[PDB]
Design a protein around this ligand. Sequence first.
Ligand SMILES: CC(C)c1ccc([C@H](O)c2nc3ccccc3[nH]2)cc1
Length: 157
Amino acid sequence: GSPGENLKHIITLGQVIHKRCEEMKYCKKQCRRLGHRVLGLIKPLEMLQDQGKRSVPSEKLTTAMNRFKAALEEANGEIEKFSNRSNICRFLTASQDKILFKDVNRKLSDVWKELSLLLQVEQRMPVSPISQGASWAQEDQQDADEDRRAFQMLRRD
Ligand SMILES: CC(C)c1ccc([C@H](O)c2nc3ccccc3[nH]2)cc1
C-alpha cells in the first residue's frame, strides 16, 4: 500500500540523527559534521514531501528507498550505542585510530546514488555532483581523530 509513514520515518531518520548529535558528548565532534553533512542527502528528500511536487513513487523507487531506510538506520543506531563512554573507550582502545561512522557514509551514499539515479533520470533532485567526489569520506577520518586527542582528557591514565 501507500500509507506514507514509510517515507516519514525514512526522511525524519536524517533529522533525528542530526539533532541527536547534540546529545553526544565525546563523538559530538564528528557527529557535528556527520549529521550536518549527511543532512544534505535528506535535504532534497524532505523537500519532495514538503513542496509536494514529485508525484507518488513507484515500486522501482520503493525498492531503492527501502534499502536506504535500513541503511541510514545504521548511523542513527551507531551514534546511539556510541553515546556510552564504555562503547567509545572499548572501541578506541580495541583498535588504533579508526572511524566510527565511516561505513555509514559509504552505505548512505551507495544506497543514495542507487535510488538517486532513477530519481534524477526524470528530474535531478540534488545539485552538486553526488556521484563523483569522495572527499567528504576522507574528511571523516580527520574528524574521528579529534575524538582521540579529546578523549585523553576524558580520562587520565
Ligand atoms: C523521496 C521520494 C522519492 C520517496 C517517497 C516515498 C517513498 C516510499 O518508500 C514509497 N512509498 C510508496 C508507495 C507506493 C509505491 C512506491 C512507494 N515508495 C520513497 C521515495
